[PDB]
Amino acid sequence: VYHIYSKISAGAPGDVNMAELDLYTTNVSFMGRTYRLDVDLRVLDDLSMYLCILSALVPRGCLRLLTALVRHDRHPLTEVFEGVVPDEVTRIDLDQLSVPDDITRMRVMFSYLQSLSSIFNLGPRLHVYAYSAETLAASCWYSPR
Amino acid sequence: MDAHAINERYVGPRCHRLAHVVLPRTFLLHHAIPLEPEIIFSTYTRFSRSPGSSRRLVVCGKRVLPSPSGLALSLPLFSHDGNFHPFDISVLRISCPGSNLSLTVRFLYLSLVVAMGAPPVRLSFNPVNADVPATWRDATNVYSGAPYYVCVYEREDDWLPIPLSFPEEPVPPPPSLVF
Amino acid sequence: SQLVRNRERKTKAHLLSLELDRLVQVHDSRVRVINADIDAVKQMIGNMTWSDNI
Amino acid sequence: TDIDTAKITLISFIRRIKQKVAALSASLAETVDRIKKWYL
Amino acid sequence: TDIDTAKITLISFIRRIKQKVAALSASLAETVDRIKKWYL
Question: Where in chain E are the domains?
Fold first, then answer.
C-alpha cells in the first residue's frame, strides 16, 4: 500500500497526507506488540504494477464472464453473489471494445490472477514446535511448496 | 417471469430501452416454436432511412407455467441520436445449438412503443427479484396477426411520452416501407 | 398482386390504430402538464394572500 | 376582503377551468375508441 | 405589493396555460393531416 502512495504523491501531492500515510504503514500490530520498520522502494516495483494492471481488468472481467454464464442450470450460489458487485460496474457497455480485442484482455487478465496468487502460496516454510526466548534456540521440520 | 428481471442487468445496460414481451401459445403455434430449455435466442434490429444494422444480442427466455401463460422474453430497443424510429423492425432469431432449426420472428416498434404507453465500509447487495409488479398490456403482431403481451414494470419521466421521430416527405407509402 | 392487395389492406388497418393510440398518449401526457400547471396556479393562490404579506 | 374575495374568485374560476380540461381527455377516450369499433 | 405581486403571478401563470392550450390544437392540425396522406 505504501509503495502505491509513493507514486501518487509524486505526480499529484494533494491526494496523499504524510500525517495519514506514515502513521498506519509504519506500525505492525502483531502478537500483542508493535514493530518499527525502516522505510525511506525498489523491490516492490512490479507488484505495484501487477496488482494495478489487474485492478482495471477485474470490473470488465466479472461482467463479461457473467453475461456468458446464464442458463437454466446456473450454479445456485451465484444468485447470491450477483448482488455484491456495485451498481456502476453493472453498467459497463462492452460495445466500445471489439471481440478480438476482448480476448487480449482475458489471457492477460487470467494470467495475473494466477501468477499473483501463486507467489503467496509458495511454501519453503517450516513448522517450529519448540522455542525459547532468551536463548534464541528453536527446532522445527520442513515441508516444501 | 424471471427472464425479464435477468435481462435488465445483463442486456439492460447494453441497450437504451427494453421491450418486455410475453408470447402466448397462439403466437407459438403460428411460428412453430418448440419450447425446450436448450434454445438460444438472438436479437438484432433492422434500421430504416439509415445504414441498417445493429449488433446481435443474446436474450434469455423461460417458459411461464400458470394472467397469461407462455414464453417470456425481452426485446432490445435502440435509440440512435436520442429518439426512436416508428418504422424500424426488431428481428428475433430463434435457434437450437445442435439440431437444424432457425426461426425468424419480426416485430415493429409502433406495436411496442405504443404498447409501453400508459469501521468497515458498506458493500451494496442487489439481487435479481420479481418483486416489481407487472401491468399487462395487449398488442397484435402486424406480420402474423397473433396477439402478444407486453409488461410495464414500475421504477423527466412522467412529464414526457416516449420520443418518436416520424419520417419526412418525400416518403414511400408505409404499406411499402414496413415490408 | 392479390397479396399486395392484402398487405396494403391489412397494414393500413393495423398501423392506423397504432397512430390513433399514439395520438391519445400525446394528448393525455399534455393534459397532465395542464393539470400540473393549473394546480400550480391554485397552490400559489393558496399562499397568494401570504405573498401579499411578504 | 383581500382574503375573502380572492378565495371565492381565484378558486371557483380555477376549478371551472380544471374540470373542462378533463372534458377534452374524456372526449378522445370516447371518440377515438368509437373509431376503433365502428370503422375498423 | 397587492398590485405588484398579483401582476407577475396572475399574468405569467395564465399565459403559460394559454400557450399550451394552443399546443393541443396545433397537434391535431399536424397529426390528423398526417393520417390523411400517409394512410389514406
Answer: 1-40
